[PDB]
Design a protein around this ligand. Structure first.
Ligand SMILES: CN(C)CC(=O)Nc1ccc2[nH]c(=O)c3ccccc3c2c1
Length: 135
């Protein structure tokens, strides 16, 4: 969880379960499906939530990262330039998207909307070592 309120993603998270496997998508893929959004707005980034646990007194490690998707110009990196090398950020965009203008899309009031469970179109190459939440 969090003890500082996050920007909330329109979608469910993707969670690492195998250490050492990278988070990635093929260029053009990796934008989660949202009913009615045009491919020109299908642009943004996945953002890594580092999680950390507590020591139990039986010794006991691991609580891997979970990634959350944010449309370009929103989220904790609402200001950065698409593409920019930033630890913990992975940019993705449909090939119809112009990544020079922010997506025209409001954040998600977590109280007047649940997260849309994360799906991808047929053919999307899923990152091995990750489990899509809600699936
Ligand atoms: C290292 N952490 C401070 C980063 C952070 O927690 N990121 C974070 C950032 C994005 C998050 N997006 C969500 O949709 C969400 C939903 C339920 C609970 C948490 C989140 C959520 C959390």
């Amino acid at each position: 969880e969090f003890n500082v309120v996050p920007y909330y993603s329109w979608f469910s998270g993707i969670t690492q379960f195998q250490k050492g496997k990278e988070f990635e998508f093929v260029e053009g893929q990796g934008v989660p499906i949202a009913p009615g959004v045009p491919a020109t707005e299908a642009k943004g980034y996945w953002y890594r939530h580092n999680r950390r646990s507590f020591k139990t007194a039986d010794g006991q490690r691991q609580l891997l990262p979970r990634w959350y998707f944010y449309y370009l110009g929103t989220g904790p990196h609402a200001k950065d330039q698409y593409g920019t090398d930033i630890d913990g950020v992975y940019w993705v965009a449909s090939n119809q998207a112009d990544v020079n203008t922010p997506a025209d899309i409001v954040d998600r009031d977590p109280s007047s909307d649940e997260a849309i469970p994360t799906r991808f179109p047929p053919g999307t190459v899923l990152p091995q070592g990750y489990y899509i939440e809600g699936s």
